[PDB]
Write a protein that binds this ligand. Structure first.
Ligand SMILES: NC[C@@]1(c2ccccc2)Cc2cc(Cl)ccc2O1
Ligand SMILES: NC[C@@]1(c2ccccc2)Cc2cc(Cl)ccc2O1
Ligand SMILES: *C(=O)CCCCCCCCCCCCC
Length: 208
């Protein structure tokens, strides 16, 4: 469970979907976090992998609160399980006890430098006593689709992991009005090698 004192990540999944005929659709999940204590990772170990200087991970952690910082290790399923005009997208859902407008910023980094940034504003929906935020079928940018295609063309999974050693995604969720940090999730990737498919391990980012 990825949750700070103000916001909780309920679900997250990146996928590709194909239309096999007018009434048939296939969907392949690359990564997924669906709906206990976490092991810790020192945030200083990953500083070099994210953009630093103004608005960087170090400045974000220093600004606080520390309870909002998480690291997700993903083992993405890049096996061609469906035959590919496919749609590549991301779906996620968050929740809070307070009604607020959020801003979800996703920074894609390559060698610690930001190459793509997507910003989406989400409005609170009152649902079962709590406030829910849904980003449904958010399309992937061409940079990411072309990156997945290029990894899928490497003949070995250890080659894909070598490339992915320099690829990270930083997700920062802030309160739109106050600009307060609600949730920060650093994503690191490897390619899945088990018949169980895509895997994930969540950690809490700490300092000492
Ligand atoms: N141009 C070669 C490289 C690459 C190689 C094989 C498969 C996919 C991509 C190396 C690389 C690292 C990152 Cl982090 C992002 C993009 C990227 O492009
Ligand atoms: N290659 C190992 C690692 C990893 C292992 C298992 C699952 C996901 C990712 C650890 C790691 C840290 C960073 Cl900053 C960037 C990439 C990265 O890849
Ligand atoms: C905007 O394009 C952000 C898209 C974030 C995609 C999440 C990546 C998870 C899909 C598997 C890729 C793993 C190796 C790149």
């Amino acid at each position: 469970t990825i949750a700070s004192s103000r916001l909780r990540l309920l679900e997250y999944s990146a996928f590709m979907e194909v239309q096999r005929d007018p009434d048939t659709y296939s969907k392949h999940l690359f990564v997924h976090i669906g709906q206990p204590p976490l092991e810790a990772v020192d945030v200083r170990q990953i500083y070099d992998k994210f953009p630093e200087k103004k608005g960087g991970l170090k400045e974000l952690y220093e600004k606080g609160p520390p309870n909002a910082f998480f690291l997700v290790k993903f083992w993405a399923d890049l096996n061609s399980t469906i035959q590919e005009g496919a749609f590549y997208g991301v779906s996620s859902q968050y929740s809070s006890a307070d009604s607020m407008t959020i801003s979800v910023s996703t920074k894609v980094c390559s060698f610690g430098k930001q190459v793509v940034e997507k910003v989406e504003t989400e409005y609170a929906r009152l649902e079962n006593g709590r406030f829910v935020y849904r980003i449904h079928r958010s399309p992937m940018c061409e940079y990411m689709i072309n990156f997945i295609h290029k990894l899928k063309h490497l003949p070995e999974k250890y080659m894909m992991n070598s490339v992915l050693e320099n690829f990270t995604i930083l997700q920062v969720v802030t309160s739109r009005d106050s600009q307060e940090t609600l949730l920060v999730i650093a994503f690191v990737f490897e390619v899945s090698t088990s018949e169980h498919g895509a895997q994930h391990h969540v950690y809490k980012l700490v300092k000492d």
